[PDB]
Design an enzyme around this catalytic site. Structure first.
Site, PDB file in Angstrom:
ATOM      1  N   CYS B 108      59.957  23.811 105.532  1.00  0.00           N
ATOM      2  CA  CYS B 108      59.245  22.517 105.105  1.00  0.00           C
ATOM      3  C   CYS B 108      60.194  21.583 105.561  1.00  0.00           C
ATOM      4  CB  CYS B 108      59.349  22.337 103.531  1.00  0.00           C
ATOM      5  SG  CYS B 108      59.072  21.036 102.871  1.00  0.00           S
ATOM      6  N   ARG B 111      62.288  18.407 102.798  1.00  0.00           N
ATOM      7  CA  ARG B 111      63.144  18.978 101.938  1.00  0.00           C
ATOM      8  C   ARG B 111      64.148  17.708 101.518  1.00  0.00           C
ATOM      9  NH1 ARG B 111      65.168  24.416 103.504  1.00  0.00           N
ATOM     10  NH2 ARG B 111      64.493  23.785 105.855  1.00  0.00           N
ATOM     11  N   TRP B 280      53.465  14.496  99.937  1.00  0.00           N
ATOM     12  CA  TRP B 280      52.590  13.807 100.800  1.00  0.00           C
ATOM     13  C   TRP B 280      52.564  14.032 102.215  1.00  0.00           C
ATOM     14  CZ3 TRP B 280      56.756  11.558  98.030  1.00  0.00           C
ATOM     15  CH2 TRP B 280      57.735  11.386  98.785  1.00  0.00           C
TER      16      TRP B 280
HETATM   17  C1  HEM Z   1      57.064  15.231  99.844  1.00  0.00           C
HETATM   18  C2  HEM Z   1      56.715  15.340 101.142  1.00  0.00           C
HETATM   19  C3  HEM Z   1      56.641  16.478 101.865  1.00  0.00           C
HETATM   20  C4  HEM Z   1      56.429  16.549 102.937  1.00  0.00           C
HETATM   21  C5  HEM Z   1      56.349  15.493 104.221  1.00  0.00           C
HETATM   22  C6  HEM Z   1      56.322  17.892 103.493  1.00  0.00           C
HETATM   23  C7  HEM Z   1      56.029  18.666 104.783  1.00  0.00           C
HETATM   24  C8  HEM Z   1      55.790  19.846 105.096  1.00  0.00           C
HETATM   25  C9  HEM Z   1      55.072  20.272 106.262  1.00  0.00           C
HETATM   26  C10 HEM Z   1      54.678  19.402 107.420  1.00  0.00           C
HETATM   27  C11 HEM Z   1      55.068  21.630 106.309  1.00  0.00           C
HETATM   28  C12 HEM Z   1      54.144  22.570 107.198  1.00  0.00           C
HETATM   29  C13 HEM Z   1      52.883  22.576 106.951  1.00  0.00           C
HETATM   30  C14 HEM Z   1      51.757  23.201 108.014  1.00  0.00           C
HETATM   31  O1  HEM Z   1      52.017  22.555 109.045  1.00  0.00           O
HETATM   32  O2  HEM Z   1      51.350  24.083 107.812  1.00  0.00           O
HETATM   33  C15 HEM Z   1      55.511  22.117 105.162  1.00  0.00           C
HETATM   34  C16 HEM Z   1      55.624  23.509 104.656  1.00  0.00           C
HETATM   35  C17 HEM Z   1      56.111  23.659 103.506  1.00  0.00           C
HETATM   36  N1  HEM Z   1      56.352  22.971 102.097  1.00  0.00           N
HETATM   37 FE1  HEM Z   1      56.736  20.844 102.483  1.00  0.00          FE
HETATM   38  N2  HEM Z   1      56.481  18.835 102.312  1.00  0.00           N
HETATM   39  C18 HEM Z   1      56.564  17.972 101.370  1.00  0.00           C
HETATM   40  C19 HEM Z   1      56.742  18.297 100.000  1.00  0.00           C
HETATM   41  C20 HEM Z   1      56.885  19.653  99.313  1.00  0.00           C
HETATM   42  C21 HEM Z   1      56.889  19.885  98.127  1.00  0.00           C
HETATM   43  C22 HEM Z   1      56.941  18.973  97.033  1.00  0.00           C
HETATM   44  C23 HEM Z   1      57.220  21.376  98.107  1.00  0.00           C
HETATM   45  C24 HEM Z   1      57.393  22.269  96.917  1.00  0.00           C
HETATM   46  C25 HEM Z   1      57.581  21.850  95.656  1.00  0.00           C
HETATM   47  C26 HEM Z   1      57.135  21.785  99.565  1.00  0.00           C
HETATM   48  C27 HEM Z   1      57.083  23.247  99.854  1.00  0.00           C
HETATM   49  C28 HEM Z   1      56.942  23.577 101.187  1.00  0.00           C
HETATM   50  C29 HEM Z   1      56.804  25.146 101.284  1.00  0.00           C
HETATM   51  C30 HEM Z   1      56.939  26.161 100.672  1.00  0.00           C
HETATM   52  C31 HEM Z   1      56.281  25.101 102.840  1.00  0.00           C
HETATM   53  C32 HEM Z   1      55.972  26.333 103.731  1.00  0.00           C
HETATM   54  C33 HEM Z   1      54.423  26.637 103.495  1.00  0.00           C
HETATM   55  C34 HEM Z   1      54.196  27.857 104.261  1.00  0.00           C
HETATM   56  O3  HEM Z   1      55.026  28.835 104.506  1.00  0.00           O
HETATM   57  O4  HEM Z   1      52.912  28.213 104.515  1.00  0.00           O
HETATM   58  N3  HEM Z   1      56.744  20.767 100.332  1.00  0.00           N
HETATM   59  N4  HEM Z   1      56.107  21.032 104.465  1.00  0.00           N
HETATM   60  C1  LIG Z   2      53.277  20.370  99.610  1.00  0.00           C
HETATM   61  C2  LIG Z   2      52.730  20.110 100.939  1.00  0.00           C
HETATM   62  C3  LIG Z   2      53.148  18.826 101.378  1.00  0.00           C
HETATM   63  C4  LIG Z   2      52.975  18.501 102.850  1.00  0.00           C
HETATM   64  N1  LIG Z   2      53.064  17.327 103.502  1.00  0.00           N
HETATM   65  N2  LIG Z   2      52.300  19.505 103.719  1.00  0.00           N
HETATM   66  C5  LIG Z   2      51.752  20.725 102.982  1.00  0.00           C
HETATM   67  C6  LIG Z   2      51.114  21.570 103.718  1.00  0.00           C
HETATM   68  C7  LIG Z   2      51.309  23.185 103.718  1.00  0.00           C
HETATM   69  C8  LIG Z   2      50.304  23.808 104.343  1.00  0.00           C
HETATM   70  C9  LIG Z   2      48.994  23.441 104.567  1.00  0.00           C
HETATM   71  N3  LIG Z   2      47.903  24.055 105.237  1.00  0.00           N
HETATM   72  C10 LIG Z   2      48.493  25.363 105.700  1.00  0.00           C
HETATM   73  C11 LIG Z   2      49.685  25.957 105.620  1.00  0.00           C
HETATM   74  C12 LIG Z   2      49.927  27.338 106.023  1.00  0.00           C
HETATM   75  C13 LIG Z   2      49.325  28.195 105.601  1.00  0.00           C
HETATM   76  C14 LIG Z   2      49.983  29.787 105.547  1.00  0.00           C
HETATM   77  N4  LIG Z   2      49.502  30.671 106.687  1.00  0.00           N
HETATM   78  C15 LIG Z   2      49.424  32.188 106.443  1.00  0.00           C
HETATM   79  C16 LIG Z   2      48.325  30.079 107.334  1.00  0.00           C
HETATM   80  C17 LIG Z   2      50.788  25.106 104.923  1.00  0.00           C
HETATM   81  C18 LIG Z   2      52.267  20.875 101.727  1.00  0.00           C
END
Ligand code: HEM
Ligand SMILES: Cc1cc(N)nc(CCc2cncc(CCCN(C)C)c2)c1
Ligand code: HEM
Ligand SMILES: Cc1cc(N)nc(CCc2cncc(CCCN(C)C)c2)c1
Ligand SMILES: C[C@H](O)[C@H](O)[C@H]1CNc2nc(N)[nH]c(=O)c2N1
Ligand SMILES: C[C@H](O)[C@H](O)[C@H]1CNc2nc(N)[nH]c(=O)c2N1
Ligand SMILES: [Zn+2]
Lengths: 407, 411
Positions: B108, B111, B280
């Site tokens: 993420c 963070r 967001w």
């Molecule tokens: C507040 C603004 C936030 C932004 C801008 C952000 C940004 C991102 C982005 C761009 C990804 C990649 C998603 C993708 O490309 O598929 C990601 C993954 C992830 N985020 Fe964040 N996030 C935010 C908040 C949070 C919150 C609140 C949580 C949990 C309480 C979180 C937990 C995670 C986790 C666990 C992943 C890994 C997803 C996976 O392994 O599939 N994020 N985040």
């Molecule tokens: C809380 C949160 C915030 C944010 N800005 N983006 C996300 C996106 C996370 C997210 C969205 N679509 C797909 C994935 C990956 C899915 C997992 N693999 C197995 C496809 C992860 C989550």
């Protein structure tokens, strides 16, 4: 033990059996992944020779044959007697091609079998090395129709007779630090440029000054040589729609030619083995021109396009980056210098990858390097799971000669 | 031991000591790196050490390590485990746990905000209807009329694995996808399978390009039930371009609230199988992946046509050129409607600062480079040039298999 990779765009899965033959270490452990880290005797020697010969002879459908056994026998004798051994021309060529084939960071490996190999193992002096290198440059450049090649200088003996090319690439622009605090030319080449000057190079202190060669033969002190200017093909950089682009004064050289790596074949080490192919567009436009620690021209280009550089969210950097890269490909194509764009290249690699899985049981690949530095997810490799691992023969990194060299 | 990472743009070198507290596996070995692989009922036997590990951490963070309160709590949990085979977290521990899972989420980029997480305790929830209500409140609170607030809602922990609470949607808000008999896809191709389930479970699909999917909610291991999020609660943004007037006519829009709902939250050996969370959007998630992936809305061609780009040679970089304008349009649209969004430049730079702060104050910051680097313009963001170490800390968010592949149907 039988590993699978998924393409998340096509749902295609491939099974990797090739990694079981891996030998060298990755840097990673069960507790930590180091995938993004840039740099993580006779009894030693014969198993290495044998492992290599075994795969050489297997590749030529003569595994477990008399000629196979004889060679093993022959090399085993020579190691016993000489503490080393000489590769046969056939083996050298195989080894070199397979080092390229095994290079997990290289996107252009579909070309791997078409490597022109220059046996420079008879070379004894730096002038010799120079002659061989000019020949390499001219052959590979081919008036703009580039051809992959490698020139291999004598193998290591006792480490005190090493052949080394001190330049990181056969062709690179000098870098000069200004009294005004800034940096003239290529900032990545500052330290090497000082060594050149410290060794006697008279710099023209320009912005695109082709560096001299620092050649080292038989563990001796390195010597300086200027590549015939008429052998260094360069491309002035213009934009197909933007007239003002040419006034930025940009040019780049046509021949990418890595010269600082170590080639390992069957336990033998080739410390001087310059090789070259041809550029992918983004290497120049994205990295060389737009890295903050390189020519860093984004700001000036953006200004010329008259973009709102007030807020990062106008994405002005991204807009300018595209155009800069458009200009590079356009400039090379217009002058008929071989170049490949990142889409075409990545698509080629996916085909190569599938070919390898199909005919070899896998293909080691470093996703971190294979994915281009712009537009990553609109290229197919982005969605391609890759397994990274170390196969031999290989190109390895080695320490820069100045830290090593006992003058 | 000590581990060093180097930023190849700035030569800043950082030292990781935190990786020593890593327990779980990476998937990697000394012979293979699996860094680009996407995916590489519990006894009292293993439970207390896991509890103790967590409670030790929690008490250290609140500067009470070794206190009587610490010792009593360990004793209390120890006894609850031997008497009841599980244990309950205090509110304080739940909140700490949930923030730290986010904090540990190596994939993420967002963070920097980890300590600012609104935790909703839905542990008293017993029915799907109860879940619906909790989730509505989450959505409303988190949306905040476009001024988005990170939140997470935590439903009851697993017990015997036969009474799991699960949100069957991968995300709280997502668009339906419908496979047509001609092989084409109406809507979001990612969601075709889930859409089909919903339909089968009784959903009346309006069958348009942007239909907000129903919630499919499973409480206490019972069959899942359909609920429709009130439309008024679903904030959406019409997509237009600031310079190109024809862009609005593409008919695009997206929802403002990204909210992951299919993951597992592990805290001190306890498994929370239903724990939706939201923050967001970073612009590229929509503009690059959601619109431009070939397996998603895939609008690059239609956009590049309207721009009249040379589409005969890929070397015209027509794809790169359209991709930029689309991402420009997403950011412009959200900003214009005053809905929280962050560009990839802003987000990666913020992450670098966050990451450095974590090294200084925590001794490390696990990060997955493959995921941290944005899907466009990679090396003009500072993360591209940042060496990172990936490892697994708990508390953590884990993948779990899709419930439709595991659920025992009561019928
Ligand atoms: C507040 C603004 C936030 C932004 C801008 C952000 C940004 C991102 C982005 C761009 C990804 C990649 C998603 C993708 O490309 O598929 C990601 C993954 C992830 N985020 Fe964040 N996030 C935010 C908040 C949070 C919150 C609140 C949580 C949990 C309480 C979180 C937990 C995670 C986790 C666990 C992943 C890994 C997803 C996976 O392994 O599939 N994020 N985040
Ligand atoms: C809380 C949160 C915030 C944010 N800005 N983006 C996300 C996106 C996370 C997210 C969205 N679509 C797909 C994935 C990956 C899915 C997992 N693999 C197995 C496809 C992860 C989550
Ligand atoms: C002919 C077309 C070729 C293309 C398009 C190509 C492309 C690339 C690219 C884009 C990289 C990433 C390097 C960087 O970003 O600095 C790379 C790395 C590499 N290539 Fe290739 N290359 C070609 C030819 C060759 C040849 C002929 C060899 C060897 C005989 C080779 C071996 C390697 C090695 C060892 C690396 C890793 C270098 C490092 O780790 O620093 N390539 N290649
Ligand atoms: C033969 C060849 C072909 C091609 N298209 N590109 C290259 C570029 C290889 C290359 C260029 N600059 C620098 C490096 C290595 C820089 C980082 N090192 C320290 C790991 C590698 C080489
Ligand atoms: C820190 C990170 O490993 C570093 O920036 C890498 C990332 N990927 C790369 N990929 C290529 N092809 N070339 C590079 O120099 C790098 N640099
Ligand atoms: C195979 C590869 O790991 C896969 O396509 C990954 C690459 N990096 C990613 N990074 C982010 N943020 N999101 C993703 O879905 C992916 N997909
Ligand atoms: Zn790894």
């Amino acid at each position: 033990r039988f590993l699978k990779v998924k393409n998340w765009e096509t749902d295609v899965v491939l099974t990797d059996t090739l990694h079981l033959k891996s030998t060298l270490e990755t840097g990673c452990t069960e507790h930590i992944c180091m995938g993004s880290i840039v740099l993580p005797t006779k009894d030693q020697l014969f198993p290495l020779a044998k492992e290599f010969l075994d795969q050489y002879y297997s590749s030529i459908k003569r595994f477990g044959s008399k000629a196979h056994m004889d060679r093993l026998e022959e090399v085993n004798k020579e190691i016993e007697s000489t503490s080393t051994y000489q590769l046969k021309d056939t083996e050298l060529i195989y080894g070199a091609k397979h080092a390229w084939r095994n290079a997990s960071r290289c996107v252009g490996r579909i070309q791997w079998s078409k490597l022109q190999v220059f046996d420079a193992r008879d070379c004894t002096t730096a002038h010799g090395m120079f002659n061989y290198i000019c020949n390499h440059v001219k052959y590979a450049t081919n008036k703009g129709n580039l051809r992959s090649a490698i020139t291999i200088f004598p193998q290591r003996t006792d480490g005190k007779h090493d052949f080394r090319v001190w330049n990181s690439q056969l062709i690179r622009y000098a870098g000069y630090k200004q009294p005004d605090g800034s940096t003239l030319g290529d900032p990545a080449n500052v330290q090497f440029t000082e060594i050149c000057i410290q060794q006697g190079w008279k710099a023209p202190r320009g912005r695109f000054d082709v560096l001299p060669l620092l050649l080292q033969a038989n563990g001796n002190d390195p010597e300086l040589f200027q590549i015939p200017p008429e052998l260094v093909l360069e491309v002035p950089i213009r934009h197909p729609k933007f007239d003002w682009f040419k006034d930025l004064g940009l040019k780049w050289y046509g021949l990418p030619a890595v010269s600082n790596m170590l080639l390992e074949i069957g336990g033998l080490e080739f410390s001087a083995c310059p090789f070259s192919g041809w550029y992918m567009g983004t290497e120049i436009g994205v990295r060389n021109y737009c890295d903050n620690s390189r020519y860093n021209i984004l700001e000036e280009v953006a200004k010329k396009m008259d973009l709102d550089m007030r807020k990062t969210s106008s994405l002005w950097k991204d807009q300018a980056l595209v155009e800069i890269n458009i200009a590079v490909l356009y400039s090379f194509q217009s002058d008929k210098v071989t170049i490949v764009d990142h889409h075409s290249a990545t698509e080629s690699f996916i085909k190569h990858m599938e070919n390898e899985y199909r005919c070899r049981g896998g293909c080691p690949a470093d996703w971190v390097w294979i994915v281009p530095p712009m537009s990553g997810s609109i290229t197919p490799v982005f969605h391609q799971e890759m397994l990274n691992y170390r196969l031999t023969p290989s190109f390895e990194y080695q320490p820069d000669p100045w830290n090593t060299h006992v003058w």
